[PDB]
Amino acid sequence: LTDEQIAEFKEAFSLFDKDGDGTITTKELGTVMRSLGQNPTEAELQDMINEVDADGNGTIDFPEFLNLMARKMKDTDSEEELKEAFRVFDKDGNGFISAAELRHVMTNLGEKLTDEEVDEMIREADVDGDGQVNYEEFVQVMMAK
């Protein structure tokens, strides 16, 4: 890994760390998951944090988050991870991410995105010309640089 990737993950981290205190609490993780359409319980949230809570302080700090994201998985594992991520963006589950779905998820997470911005994103990613983003098209954007 390198600086650019670290800075990128730090921004990803900020989507969870709503108060900017440098740690992700179960409440913050819950807020993000609920914005994605999930409904995790307190127990489930504590278990998730416990998976990477090396210092036992009950929260995920950036070093812990970075370690989680830097971990290299097998191709098979990576493929299933990407598919799971795709399903989160593909709100209606029709196998395609629309501009409406993409903007909604991104905005709910904490990202600022205009219609023209999302239009451009979909356009660039749309390889087959159907106006939407399917799984493999999604993989290309995720792996791009």
């Binding site: 969870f16 994605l36 799971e84």
Partner: peptide
């Protein structure tokens, strides 16, 4: 700048933790 990828990282993070 790389907004989509950034959100992608966050989504994948939740996946990793759920696994």
């Amino acid at each position: 700048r790389r907004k989509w990828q950034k959100t992608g990282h966050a989504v994948r993070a939740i996946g990793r933790l759920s696994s």
